[model samples]
Target: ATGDERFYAEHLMPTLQGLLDPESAHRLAVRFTSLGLLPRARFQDSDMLEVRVLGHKFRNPVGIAAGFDKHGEAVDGLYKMGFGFVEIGSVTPKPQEGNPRPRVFRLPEDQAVINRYGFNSHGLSVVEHRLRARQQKQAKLTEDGLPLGVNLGKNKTSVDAAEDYAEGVRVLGPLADYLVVNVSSPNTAGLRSLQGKAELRRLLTKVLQERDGLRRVHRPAVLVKIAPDLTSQDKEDIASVVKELGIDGLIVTNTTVSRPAGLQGALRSETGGLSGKPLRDLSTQTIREMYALTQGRVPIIGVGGVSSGQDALEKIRAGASLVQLYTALTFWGPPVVGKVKRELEALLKEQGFGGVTDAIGADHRR
Candidate 1:
């Protein structure tokens, strides 16, 4: 655990610096990845736990969520830290400067953050080049494979949003174990509009068409992410869309725009979406609704304020097949990933749940 003062001095300051100059911070992030410098933490055991989703094997259900490393840099560092999987990029077709500075803000009191960082990325070419190089290096290291997924998005200035997403998949799909078509981020100006039925169908149909064209020895699975603030009707719409489109998975939520009813302090008034504790129930509810609507036919990747093993398990019981977290990492540090996994294992054992998979939706029927 990070000492209170150390948390302020070490982790907090560096994160603040990163927010100050995101582009330069991205460069530093790449260097850290190259050197394998990771946040300090420890795993309780050496035993490997695996979960398969989207036709790929993850060492565990714990993964670093997107928005942490919008560019492909730092994936290897994240992988070295015992994360089961690492998702990189909300990379768009063209490189574009995202929303203005001061876009990312921290809420220490709430253990949350809000960023309207409009998917500012180095574009698909940069991510593609870096991924290709990273893969080559991994190939030399060992025949054992590394699981990496790419999150795709439309460029901010693009006129045709669906085409932009299609282009992103066309360029990066072949290299990924899975691809996430992100229309959920609240920062992009008209981006969430694509979540509507007609728009979603058009966008997904285009990407799936591209995926079909790219199938060789291995084909990347495609998934969609939804916003946490969706209404019950919206949830039904999303479930129907997923079933009809045959999407490989659904990332249960992006950050939320709704402020929890009783959050305190100035950060609550800040612009942009809120993530962490405030989003916990909202996200879990969405997961449950989606699970009910889909009848477990489609897989759901639950995400939102998961800070401990119990929190992760709750999502599983509420109907998540897999779970992810980002805000918790900021507060608990990297070792939290392994810690949560170990604790989850203990909980599963105590309940006589043979494995993580067995725990999925066990409490939902009640």
Candidate 2:
């Protein structure tokens, strides 16, 4: 499945399109509330895993990662699946087609994926329309409410990425419980460059200014996602930027460009970002570094290569306030999320931690 482009085109591609399109087989799957679709299937306990972050309560610490639901079309369905929270979109200020076709590739041997989708989205206005409708549905259903986060990005053709980001925040931030500034996707050229200290500070400064101007009673919390390929120095620089800019939290380690040491797969040569088992160690290492550098000052959400409950526990111990997964769902179907959450609670009890937050960074210095 890794290197055979024909197999990918014939079998894998159709399957993925069907699963993700939300208009194919997944349409009904997405709408079903009783069954935890995709990542929410394996774990079954409603009371076992809960945590509070960004001034909201998550039923569980496991959330569906961004890029899975790029549009707001499936938010209510995803919420029904039992995710602690859901973050939709890497949406641009305006709609754009993104990269050309044949953009997503699978590497089964390494359990990774290489995608160059280039932030293809239906645009901010469409997403806002969907969000408004979804929020109304949510408000009618529950008094406590569900946690929803929005992942924001600039358009591919934008001259000023900062302004584009600000526009996304201004338009979508009000609908979100929190907002993620996604500057780490390798598919987009020049996007990652914004991670530099000064650039990040300016970007955050502008985004925060826009956020402040919203002046809403419940302003969305702002978090930034960074690349896993960062060096030690880069991590420190980002830490400084986070502190200086007063960002709410960080989603450490997006997909990696640097391949792992012992991967043997056909798609190994595919050009794009890699995510899955090979990414676990690299992403976790970056999370540990950030935790140590920040001295726990900023909350961190760990994502990358999460396939099991034990892996989720390790991330919690390594210092993730919350965790997310995308690749595993591709590999194992929707049930992976629930399984990971159930296993996480069991592990927490076995280790004598009262709750998920108590396990955060507990073994980092060890």
Candidate 3:
């Protein structure tokens, strides 16, 4: 149950969390991981935990969310930690530092974080090269057959958002197992507006067109990431557009810009999206609504405040085909991945479910 995780929890994390600010700590973790030095997961998951999504069979249903590896730098290390998949980037078309310092805040009491990092990225070319270099290595991170999902974002200064997204598809599409059109990040100004029916149709149409133009036989599954802060009209519009455009899946949420009631005084006032425990129920409800709205046809990647096996199971029952976590890693350290997987596998058996696929949307059936 412990090896490198003991170091991660006892020594490494305390030192990092104590000495560095949240963003710096984040940078160091990414840099350290890009070197591929972390120990691989010790636990081998049961086949009962496996599920197929995006035309790929995931060894388990847990994935690290996108923002954690914004540049695709830590794919090998993260995948090695036993995630069924690793999602990287919110990479922009061009390199751009996101918002200024103090943009990230840790609310330990709430077990939440609010970040306004408006999509800082090293751009397509650089990130593409990094991924290509990783691809050439003999001992690959995803060699175990897990997929890599690339989440695409836009530059803040960009005028044409669709063009930015389409450009990402052109450059990174061929390399990705699945592509995420992340129009929901709260940090980016006017980005969420693209979720509107007309704009979403136009944006996804162009991005899908670009994806189709790729020569690769395995065309990446294109999914849209939506914000939790949505009106009923907004939800319906998004569902309608996704179905009409044949978008492969939907990431049920990004962080929520609206602060829920009962937060700590100071941290509560911070601007940006709030992620972690506070966002859990809201995201799950959104998943339920989106699942029913789409009539359960589209695959949904549920992510928000997942921290335990129960959390993962809740999302699956609520209609998320797969689930993801980022903040939990920050709070619980590396062992969190193995912990969640172990807990989820047990929960699945306890409930008499044969495998993950059967549990997906189980709540909807009731």
Candidate 4:
């Protein structure tokens, strides 16, 4: 049981934190998970958790967001931990050594993380080779009955941003069940500018063209990831562009540049994007707004500060078709995944809903 697993993992957390810096601890996690060392989750999701969205079946709606596996190293291990899906990358076309060291900081007091990794990546070629190898070994790349998503980012110095995203679509789209155009990361200067309506249309048009050129039988769905810090006008523009272009879906937000006033951590002053408990309400509100702006026509993967079942359920009610988290995995440890799913199932049942799909955007119905 996860109680014991939780106890041990939760106990081990402080030691890992005390011994390693945030970045090193992150590398250790990736290395160990990739080696298949973490205990596999024993909990079996109930039928109530199943849902079909974005043309694929999700065993459950909980997912691990990008930035956790910046490269494609630990997909199998993450899936084994009981997440319904895994999204890897914020990967660039060319290998990039991101921002300077000490770019990741843990805010234990506030239960948050501040990161400015700036698209640190092992490059598209390396990730492509790894996925190809994984595909050959597994027969079906998604042996776990769920799909894997690839989140793409442009190089920091790229002169033409459209070419960067199109290149990613050409190479990685066939391999991804879904592809995310992550234009919201705060650390990457000018990256969020792509969310502008005209610019977004141009970029997505090129990326979709590349995706269309791929010869795969099942083409990947393309979703755009946006920032939580957006003007009302900005939100409207995003919704319009996505609907006009028929973009597959939206990842409600990346991290936030705005820090809530009551953050108790000393590291709260850090300059990078903040994720975890601090981001919950802001992101949920955005999901609600985007859902309304688009009239709930687009599927949304709600990220930002989803650490518990209630947190996930709120986003679902607010219009998130699925939910994801990265910071909670660090703070609450591995059992949090199983814990979140179990809680969500219980909450759905308590609300008299038969399944997760029934609960999605329940607030909008009222």
Candidate 5:
């Protein structure tokens, strides 16, 4: 454990996990973390944990999924805790209040979460400045194995959601190491309607077209984040689009609307995107199916219900080059990053795999 393990694991994690309301706790955590106040994680496997993706070298394949650092509130703090990368946003063109209060819930019994924040954001203009400042401040510090990613979402009221995404690409394309065209969040009305192959093609076409025009030293990779509630045909349709569009990667899941049969949480019936342990198998299957569909050609970032290294390795074997987490942090706190990374390193060694990259798509490869 690093210097802050006791402070974080003993004090911070317990207090946040037990005392505060989930959403309110989230807000407070971000505020403290934004000031670079969190304990730095004990980086478990920096040497051989490296992998090349989208033309960048990551110290490890585990990254914090988007939504945690919306508006770029805590990029520096996140890297301090040892994630190889951090994804922020689902940010829209303009600021909008998501759903009303009582919008988020925690189900400790089920180790799950339900939320409908509806992409509440401070707008890209505000976020861009934070990122600009982050980069400027970060240049003087040593690299923390954290490459920043921006997830683009459309405003709920935008006449042209695609246009909003285009603006995201226009402004944030260069600033991010990668850009995720997020059409999968379940909060916004009719957002998932764009998942159709026809609409998706058009949407990504415009985003990619905007990317082509950007004047930058290095081009950021374009990725698509999809919902876990897709049909097999939907998976095939998306795979073809990804191949056709030359999109860099796919984040296999966002959250789910399906409630498991035995879901024991008090708020299990609450309407919104369901995330955490309940999402494990559904998302892993999506990764397996997508890997099969792509013949392991396109890289996949597996997410959902990953709270441990074993869970993460399952994602890799099912065919994920990288993995992301969000809900787990709510339960496990910041040190979860280091704990998962250390356990993952041991699993890789036990299996005799070279590293995470070698184990990518271990279960299925043609």
Candidate 6:
């Protein structure tokens, strides 16, 4: 049944998990979502669950993060699954094949994934058409619509990475509800350099300048996605830059480059970003640090190792305004989306928090 979340979790998940090739399973999953075949989330909008952050209203706080539909094939498809928002792309300026085959791997042993899927994308124009048709070139937010975010990235051959992002802002700002300057993907060599204090400021400055030139009725919010692997000072540097520039938001902690000793997956040694259970604690700590640095002012979209409702709430308690996931879906199937939303809504009520906003940054407030 399309409406049955339990059936997918109980029956469909095991079948999908049996596929050894993680990328193949992922492609099949994409096909289903792009066709709008999966069930929509069970919990609809509620006063307690609705959130407006970075100038857009979210019917629920859980969303599909970047790197899912790198080509923007399923913005509406994922929306059908009940995510309040779906951020597609890490799209580059031109079509690039990214890394070689077998770049994506499943770590069932750890409920995690290790992928070196660089920034594989169909490039700007392909993605542009999809979002354009989905939104019908409408720049305004809609009550029944799912917010679409474009996570912009650079081509492997870029001479100046900042220009790639600036061009992205100039071209896609009007098409996206929010824009993420993704300078943290580990698969891209030298991309991490952009996270440096001086470098980050320079990049954001150009991106912001570009955003200002766009002729939209409402300018898209700009955010930066970062890696979880960072020193305490590194965290502070980012918080300082974000607060200073007043960036719309930050996706706290992309996949980590560091491998955990406890990780037992065969692919644990893979040279890509490591995401899942082990990353939960590490990324959550990053959220806490970033919150303290900003004093809970900057909105954060916490992502990494969130496989359940409690995990989502922990990110909010730590300082995230909203949370997102991907690896968890590999194991739990699409139904996990609504499951987390329902569980999160119940958890919020149980704690006596009037709404998602009240629960946000609760731990940091203390």
Q: What TM-score, over all chains together, does every model reach?
A: 0.90, 0.88, 0.95, 0.97, 0.95, 0.95
How would you encode candidate 4's per-residue C-alpha lDDT over 139-172 as one tens digit per residue?
3635545789999999999999999998899888
Alpha-carbon lDDT, every model? 0.78, 0.79, 0.89, 0.89, 0.85, 0.85
- What is the Cα-based lDDT of residue 295 in candidate 6? 84
lDDT of 2 by residue, 245-296 (tens): 7899999778888877787877677777888899998888888889888888
- Tens-digit lDDT string for candidate 3 (166-249): 889988887788999999998888889999899889889999999988886547899999999999999999999989889999
- Name the candidate, 2 or 6, with the larger TM-score value: 6
In lDDT terms, which candidate is top?
4
Report backbone clashes per prediction: 0, 11, 0, 0, 0, 0
Ten residues in sequence with the least summed lDDT for candidate 1: 137-146
lDDT of 4 at 249: 97
Instruction: At residue 9, give the lDDT of candidate 3.
Output: 67
Each model's Cα RMSD? 3.1, 5.2, 2.0, 1.5, 2.1, 2.0
Q: Ranking by TM-score, best first? A: 4, 6, 3, 5, 1, 2
Report the C-alpha lDDT of model 5 over 210-275, residue by residue, as the tens digit.
998887653678999999999878888999999999989999889998998879988999989999
Candidate 4 vs candidate 6: the lDDT winner is 4
Model number with the top TM-score: 4
Instruction: Candidate 1: list runs displaced more than 4 Å.
Output: 1-34, 39-41, 44-48, 137-146
| Per-residue lDDT value at 4 in model 4 | 48
Per-residue lDDT for 131-202 in model 1, tens only? 888676643322233477789988877899988888888888877878999999988888887888888888
lDDT score, candidate 1, position 214 = 90
Determine the C-alpha RMSD for candidate 5 after optimal superposition of all C-alphas: 2.1
With candidate 4 superimposed using the best TM-score fit, by how many Å does residue 287's alpha carbon deviate from the native? 0.5
